Amino acid sequence: RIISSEVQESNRTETELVGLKQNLINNKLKLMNVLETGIMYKLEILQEQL
Amino acid sequence: SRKLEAEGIFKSLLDTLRQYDSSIQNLTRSRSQLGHNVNDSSLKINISENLLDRDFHEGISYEQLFPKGSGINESIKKSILKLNDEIQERIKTIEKDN
């Protein structure tokens, strides 16, 4: 009972938190995609044109 | 009467031990999926399946399998509670990372 409701339940919450961590990392990678290859690339081309 | 009762209770105990081992394996797998490789043998409880095969002239006692200072509540339950506390600390660490 302690495992299923306290230990393994805490481990399930930990797995959900790790999944949230991976989702946040993926969102961060998307932001670097929009930023580096994007808004910095857009900044570079805009500065070149200007 | 007590022999039939003991046979039934021994079968139930073996089933409960198998269930506990399965739950320990599941917990270990879930922890390893998070990078914490829990030692499966450390949490598993070892009981001889041939314990009841002894002649009843020889005694069987809790101290034979769980001597003082090493019982389930004495050490194993405390160790598992400490593991749960460490899991909660890792939960706090991962929440801080999030």
* Three-state SS letters, B38-93: CCHHHHCCCCCCCHHHCCCCCCCCHHHHCCCCCCHHHHHHHHHHHHHHHHHHHHHH
Report the C-alpha gap between B96 and A43 in whole angstroms. Answer: 34
Report the gap between the CA of B95 and the closest CA in chain A (Å). 7
Report the C-alpha gap between B47 and B65 in whole angstroms. Answer: 7
Cβ-Cβ pairs closer than 8 A, A with B, add up to 49
* Model resolution, angstroms: 3.2
Cβ contacts of B93-96, under 8 Å, gap ≥ 24:
B94/A14, B94/A17, B94/A18, B94/A21, B95/A17
3-state secondary structure of A47: helix
Report the C-alpha gap between B55 and B13 in whole angstroms. Answer: 19
The answer to whether residues B83 and A7 touch, using CB atoms and an 8 Å cutoff, is: yes
Using CB atoms, pick whichever of B26, B91, B95 lies closest to residue A10: B91
The answer to whether residues B43 and A24 touch, using CB atoms and an 8 Å cutoff, is: no
What are the chain B neighbours of A25 within 8 Å (beta carbons)? none
List, in order, residues 6 or more apart from B21 with CB less than 8 Å away.
Answer: B44, B45
| Residue type (1 letter), A16 | E
Report the C-alpha gap between B38 and B30 in whole angstroms. Answer: 9
| Residue type (1 letter), B1 | S
